[PDB]
Structures are given as structure tokens and as C-alpha cells.
Amino acid sequence: RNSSRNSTPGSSRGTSPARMAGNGGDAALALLLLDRLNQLESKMSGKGQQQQGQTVTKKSAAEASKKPRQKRT
Amino acid sequence: QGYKSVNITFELDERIDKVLNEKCSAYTVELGTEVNEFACVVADAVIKTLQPVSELLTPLGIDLDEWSMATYYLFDESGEFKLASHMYCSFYPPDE
Q: How many Cα atoms are found within 13 Å in the side-chain-facing hemisphere of A63?
């Protein structure tokens, strides 16, 4: 119902485990928000990404350790 | 020249754990990154990429309003400031 094509459940029956890890894929309800927004914000050229995470900040972490600033007072 | 990148766990446990651990858990440090800016940087990445949705995140089970207003502390063992391969980003002190 609702879904017929694309995305499969994976494994359903099991009694004797051998690998322990490997049911079908990753995430069940978080895949919608993750895929939609994480791929929506992507504007760089690549298409085939294997490892996520490389850069985050440069001016925020380097300016705080190089030049200390006071807050409130 | 080289960057030291590591994986962090910010509140993640049984929800969005592997999702953000594989997508936004590898940050660059040792090139001038601290712990306070580390908590604010992880909070900013998750709040910048995941927050623009809200539609699925609010019925999902999380509030998403305590991740942008409330900050977490980063520790490695018991409660010390050190840089390791896997750091723990969670709340430990009392709330005022």
C-alpha cells in the first residue's frame, strides 16, 4: 500500500545470525529529511559521493583562537 | 599541511544517529579548532542542513527547538577537554 516501486524492505525472516549487521539499508523514517535537505543544499559538482564531511568552518574557529573577544562586558 | 578530521556524537543515539554520523560528524580540527567552537560548529551544521525541513522532524518525535537554543558540551573521558577520533557531544551541567 502507498509504495510499490523503488526502495525495498530487505530481510524479514531470520533465526541463525552469521554477519549480525546487514538488514537492508540505512534509516527508515530519517531518510526523507536527510536525503531531501542534505541533497537540496548541495550545489557543488561531484554526483558520486562516498565519504561525507570534509569542511565546516574556517573563519569561526580560527578567529576565536587567534583573536580572543569578550562578551556582555 | 594537513587537517585533522574526527567524528562526533551530538545527542545522537536511536534517532538520526547513523544519518548525521555518516553525513555530518566528520569535522576539521587541530588547525585551530577549540571545544566551544566545536559544539557551536556541530550545532550549526545539523541546524543548517536538517532544520530547513521541520515538516517531517516535528511529527517524527523531536522538538528541533532545543537544538538551536540549547548548546551541548564536548568531552572525551569523564569530563575533560581533549581531541580524539571519537568525541562525545552532550549536555552534562545543570540548567538555569
A: 5
Report d(CA B51, CA B53) in Å as an integer: 5
Nearest-by-Cβ selection for A60 from B16, B22, B37: B37
**A21: helix, strand or coil:** coil
Question: Domain B4-90 belongs to what architecture?
Answer: Roll (3.10)
- Which residues from chain A sit within 8 angstroms of residue B60, using beta carbons? 29-30, 33
Solved using: NMR
- For chain B, the domains span 4-90
Using an 8 Å Cβ cutoff, are B23 and B42 in contact? no
Contact B5 A54 (CB under 8 A): yes
